[PDB]
Amino acid sequence: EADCGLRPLFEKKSLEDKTERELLESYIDG
Amino acid sequence: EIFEPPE
Amino acid sequence: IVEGSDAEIGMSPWQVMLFRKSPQELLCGASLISDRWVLTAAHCLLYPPWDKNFTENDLLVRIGKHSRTRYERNIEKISMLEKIYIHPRYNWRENLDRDIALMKLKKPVAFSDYIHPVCLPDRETAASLLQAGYKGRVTGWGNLKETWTAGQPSVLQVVNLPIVERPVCKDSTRIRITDNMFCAGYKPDEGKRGDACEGDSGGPFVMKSPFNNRWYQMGIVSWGEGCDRDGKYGFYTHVFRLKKWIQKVIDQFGE
Ligand SMILES: *C[C@@](*)(O)[C@H](CCCNC(N)=[NH2+])NC(=O)[C@@H]1CCCN1C(=O)[C@H](N)Cc1ccccc1
Ligand SMILES: *[C@@H]1O[C@H](CO)[C@@H](O)[C@H](O)[C@H]1NC(C)=O
Ligand SMILES: [Cl-]
Ligand SMILES: [Cl-]
Numbered sequence: 001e002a003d004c005g006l007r008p009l010f011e012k013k014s015l016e017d018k019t020e021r022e023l024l025e026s027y028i029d030g
Numbered sequence: 031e032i033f034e035p036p037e
Numbered sequence: 038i039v040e041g042s043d044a045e046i047g048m049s050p051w052q053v054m055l056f057r058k059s060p061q062e063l064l065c066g067a068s069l070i071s072d073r074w075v076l077t078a079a080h081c082l083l084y085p086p087w088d089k090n091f092t093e094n095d096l097l098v099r100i101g102k103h104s105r106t107r108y109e110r111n112i113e114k115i116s117m118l119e120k121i122y123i124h125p126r127y128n129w130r131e132n133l134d135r136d137i138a139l140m141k142l143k144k145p146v147a148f149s150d151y152i153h154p155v156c157l158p159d160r161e162t163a164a165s166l167l168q169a170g171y172k173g174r175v176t177g178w179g180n181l182k183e184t185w186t187a188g189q190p191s192v193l194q195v196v197n198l199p200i201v202e203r204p205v206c207k208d209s210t211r212i213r214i215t216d217n218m219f220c221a222g223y224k225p226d227e228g229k230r231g232d233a234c235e236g237d238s239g240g241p242f243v244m245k246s247p248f249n250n251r252w253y254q255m256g257i258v259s260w261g262e263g264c265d266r267d268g269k270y271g272f273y274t275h276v277f278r279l280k281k282w283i284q285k286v287i288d289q290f291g292e
């Protein structure tokens with residue numbers, strides 16, 4: 001749906017949660 | 031446990 | 038959730054609680070995928086070896102919650118169910134293959150800071166993200182420790198876990214695995230811990246796409262043996278694999 005997956009209190013405010021970087025790290029790091 | 035009710 | 042932490046407020050605004058009306062009971066988790074549709078595990082609704090067969094009138098959904106037991110005034114929304122739809126090839130007799138159900142709400146729910154739908158994956162997303170070692174996130178108000186091990190969280194729990202390769206999942210259990218499932222969690226030699234548990238079923242396994250910054254639901258908490266055991270892994274319903282069923286139901290029965 002058009003606006004799915006963007007969280008009003010995080011993505012929509014350019015704020016990151018405490019552990020989301022851990023996910024991204026897993027996708028990039030060796 | 032115990033759930034708080036609405037309202 | 039075992040060995041996770043407290044969620045931040047609004048961290049998982051698609052989290053849904055399935056709640057039994059009478060007697061009052063948290064049954065399982067669920068996820069919000071549009072204003073009228075909630076996704077969950079079929080075994081939460083139908084599991085005849087334990088005499089479980091809930092109808093629409095037996096249940097409510099509670100959306101926008103953080104506290105497990107408090108009534109969150111002006112934050113949570115309570116919705117009734119119009120209709121439950123269970124995968125016609127859900128196999129409760131053997132291995133919970135296709136352990137997937139949709140519930141249509143009676144009325145659309147209004148979105149808010151605390152309530153907001155998760156994306157379902159398209160083929161490119163599933164292919165990019167469904168790789169061994171890549172991590173997703175699992176949320177739920179299920180047990181804090183293995184069942185019998187004796188318990189419940191005060192607030193919603195969150196753990197991040199890596200996808201595990203098929204041969205490792207397959208060799209981990211004598212339950213027959215299918216391509217409609219995947220497993221996640223740390224190997225013994227990786228040191229770190231974490232697992233979903235009883236009462237977490239139906240909650241989402243989500244991954245954040247670096248292509249568009251959106252959260253996608255890749256998995257549904259489905260089953261496991263104990264929780265957080267060395268050499269065991271939690272199993273999840275493979276959502277992209279069942280997406281054609283999901284779409285079929287929404288197309289026919291939506292508004
Ligand atoms: C319904 C749930 O909340 C729950 C999720 C368990 C998640 N566990 C871990 N460690 N990630 N699922 C169940 O309890 C399902 C319902 C049927 C029994 N079951 C199991 O997980 C059993 N413990 C194992 C099993 C038995 C039969 C068929 C498949 C799995
Ligand atoms: C479950 O309930 C419905 C009606 O409430 C019924 O049609 C179905 O056969 C029931 N039992 C089982 C085991 O599915
Ligand atoms: Cl309603
Ligand atoms: Cl066991």
Ligand SMILES: [Cl-]
Nearest residue numbers: 073290291292
């Ligand atoms: Cl609809």
Ligand code: NA
Nearest residue numbers: 016017020021
């Ligand atoms: Na960050």
Ligand code: NA
Nearest residue numbers: 082083090091
């Ligand atoms: Na049912």
Ligand code: NA
Nearest residue numbers: 265266267269
């Ligand atoms: Na484990």
